[PDB]
Design a protein around this motif. Structure first.
Motif, PDB file in Angstrom:
ATOM      1  N   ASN A   6       0.818  -1.207   0.000  1.00  0.00           N
ATOM      2  CA  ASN A   6       0.000   0.000   0.000  1.00  0.00           C
ATOM      3  C   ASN A   6       0.862   1.271   0.000  1.00  0.00           C
ATOM      4  OD1 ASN A   6      -1.678   2.177   1.764  1.00  0.00           O
ATOM      5  ND2 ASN A   6      -3.007   0.963   0.449  1.00  0.00           N
TER       6      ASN A   6
ATOM      7  N   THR B 192       0.145   4.435   0.187  1.00  0.00           N
ATOM      8  CA  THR B 192      -0.167   5.421   1.212  1.00  0.00           C
ATOM      9  C   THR B 192       0.575   5.093   2.507  1.00  0.00           C
ATOM     10  OG1 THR B 192      -2.318   6.039   0.302  1.00  0.00           O
ATOM     11  CG2 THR B 192      -2.008   6.355   2.676  1.00  0.00           C
ATOM     12  N   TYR B 193       0.550   3.827   2.920  1.00  0.00           N
ATOM     13  CA  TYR B 193       1.248   3.441   4.142  1.00  0.00           C
ATOM     14  C   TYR B 193       2.760   3.567   3.994  1.00  0.00           C
ATOM     15  CZ  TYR B 193      -2.388   2.017   7.323  1.00  0.00           C
ATOM     16  OH  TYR B 193      -3.428   2.013   8.201  1.00  0.00           O
TER      17      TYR B 193
ATOM     18  N   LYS C 106       4.698   5.390   1.782  1.00  0.00           N
ATOM     19  CA  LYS C 106       5.267   6.737   1.658  1.00  0.00           C
ATOM     20  C   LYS C 106       5.142   7.508   2.973  1.00  0.00           C
ATOM     21  CE  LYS C 106       2.900   7.772  -1.830  1.00  0.00           C
ATOM     22  NZ  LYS C 106       1.931   8.027  -2.924  1.00  0.00           N
TER      23      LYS C 106
ATOM     24  N   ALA D  98      -0.716   7.350   9.067  1.00  0.00           N
ATOM     25  CA  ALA D  98      -0.938   7.583   7.626  1.00  0.00           C
ATOM     26  C   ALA D  98      -2.374   7.963   7.283  1.00  0.00           C
ATOM     27  CB  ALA D  98      -0.516   6.347   6.817  1.00  0.00           C
TER      28      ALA D  98
ATOM     29  N   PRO E 197      -5.400  10.226   6.338  1.00  0.00           N
ATOM     30  CA  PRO E 197      -5.822  11.566   5.929  1.00  0.00           C
ATOM     31  C   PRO E 197      -6.553  12.281   7.062  1.00  0.00           C
ATOM     32  CG  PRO E 197      -6.431   9.931   4.285  1.00  0.00           C
ATOM     33  CD  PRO E 197      -6.010   9.183   5.492  1.00  0.00           C
TER      34      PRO E 197
ATOM     35  N   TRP F 282      -6.836   3.273   4.466  1.00  0.00           N
ATOM     36  CA  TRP F 282      -7.377   4.606   4.226  1.00  0.00           C
ATOM     37  C   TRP F 282      -7.863   4.763   2.799  1.00  0.00           C
ATOM     38  CZ3 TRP F 282      -7.885   5.777   8.899  1.00  0.00           C
ATOM     39  CH2 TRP F 282      -6.878   5.561   9.844  1.00  0.00           C
ATOM     40  N   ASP F 283      -7.100   4.197   1.867  1.00  0.00           N
ATOM     41  CA  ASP F 283      -7.408   4.303   0.445  1.00  0.00           C
ATOM     42  C   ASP F 283      -8.817   3.821   0.125  1.00  0.00           C
ATOM     43  OD1 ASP F 283      -4.850   5.270   0.039  1.00  0.00           O
ATOM     44  OD2 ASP F 283      -4.099   3.409  -0.852  1.00  0.00           O
TER      45      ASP F 283
END
Lengths: 175, 8, 179
Positions: A31, A33-34, A36, A99, A101, A154-155
């Protein structure tokens, strides 16, 4: 509660395995998002061996079901099948933020059943060489116990599981 | 923060 | 026959303070000999406990408990003692009988910090697969249990007896062999 979240992950995960499909996509490693955000790779232990990546776990599952010669299973027998007997889940951080948002933080309070870090235990049986719906004609039978730490994807939650929660830690035992 | 110490 | 995944010994990766050792040495000794003392030491108002199933002394016990105010039973801190009272008497092997235990543990990130001074705290995940002798005196039931037990440990609340606490305790009671 929160069994409902665990149920959807559990159904996805052992179905992939039983359909000879990869489970690596369910781990935090894959993932963006996690990663980065700086999340470490999933902590994976398989029967006491630390396994560095989810991809290697998939390879190990493939090797377990591999048949090499001299003997061969009759047709219609399935090399490896995992049957889940029970699962149980506890929330170990109801205010999980890593992570996230900011909007998800704002939209869902810790009481709201979304931003949950979960500890999941799964138990059942591993059947080697049994007919796909038989629990009696196996060559070998093991007990298995899997435990996971699951974190919010989150995505997906921004917009059941197999993608709603991601694996951050995983321990597998069979004997 | 940790009470378990660093892993070796 | 396809070949099952290789089985290795316990993989104990806890932090340098060796909390997994201190905790588990206390846990199984007290579980056998002074069980309720565990709760004030390590359990608090937020700890959750489950007992799951995958004649069985525990089966009849958890049945009656659940009726009153493969199968599952989940409780909060208010009922943990009462439930533990009803669970069978046990004798576990010593932890130094290493081949009789499968204990895997590691430290992991992103628990909450109960002091609120930091956004995150490290946790410790301990999963145990073991066996014990179980007895129920009244029903003359004596046998060997195979079980799983998963603990999540993390920093304790200010003032607690130890610097760590149990967040989550998941007990799975599978096989029971009469003897």
């Amino acid at each position: 509660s929160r069994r409902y979240a665990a149920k959807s992950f559990v159904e996805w995960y052992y179905r992939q395995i039983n359909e000879n499909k990869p489970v690596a996509s369910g781990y935090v490693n894959n993932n963006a998002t996690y990663t980065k955000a700086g999340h470490p790779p999933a902590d994976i232990t398989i029967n006491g061996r630390v396994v560095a990546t989810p991809e290697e776990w998939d390879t190990m599952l493939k090797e377990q079901r591999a048949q090499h010669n001299t003997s061969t299973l009759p047709i219609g027998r399935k090399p490896v099948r995992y049957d889940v007997d029970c699962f149980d889940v506890h929330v170990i951080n109801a205010d999980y933020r890593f992570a996230a948002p900011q909007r998800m933080i704002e939209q869902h309070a810790p009481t709201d059943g979304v931003r949950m870090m979960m500890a999941l235990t799964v138990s059942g049986s591993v059947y080697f060489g049994a007919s796909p719906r038989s629990t009696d004609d196996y060559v070998i039978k093991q007990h298995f116990n899997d435990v996971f730490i699951l974190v919010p994807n989150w995505d997906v939650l921004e917009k059941r599981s197999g993608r709603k929660y991601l694996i951050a830690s995983h321990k597998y035992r069979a004997y | 923060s940790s009470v378990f110490g660093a892993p070796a | 026959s396809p070949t099952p995944l290789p089985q290795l010994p316990s993989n104990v990766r806890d932090g340098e303070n060796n909390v997994a050792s201190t905790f588990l040495q206390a846990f199984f000794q007290l579980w056998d000999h002074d069980r309720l003392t565990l709760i004030p030491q390590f359990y608090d108002s937020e700890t959750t406990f489950s007992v799951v199933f995958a004649q069985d002394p525990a089966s009849s016990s958890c049945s009656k408990f659940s009726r009153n105010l493969l199968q599952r039973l989940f409780v909060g801190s208010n009922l943990i003692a009462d439930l533990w009272k009803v669970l069978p008497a046990t004798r576990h092997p010593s932890l130094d009988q290493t081949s009789q235990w499968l204990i895997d543990c590691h430290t992991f990130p992103h628990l909450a910090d109960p002091t609120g001074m930091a956004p995150y705290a490290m946790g410790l995940m301990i999963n145990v697969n073991g066996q014990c002798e179980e007895a129920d005196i009244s029903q003359n039931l004596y046998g060997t249990r195979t079980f799983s037990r998963c603990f999540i440990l993390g920093p304790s609340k200010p003032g607690a007896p130890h610097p760590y606490r149990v967040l989550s305790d998941q007990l799975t009671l599978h096989t029971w062999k009469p003897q």
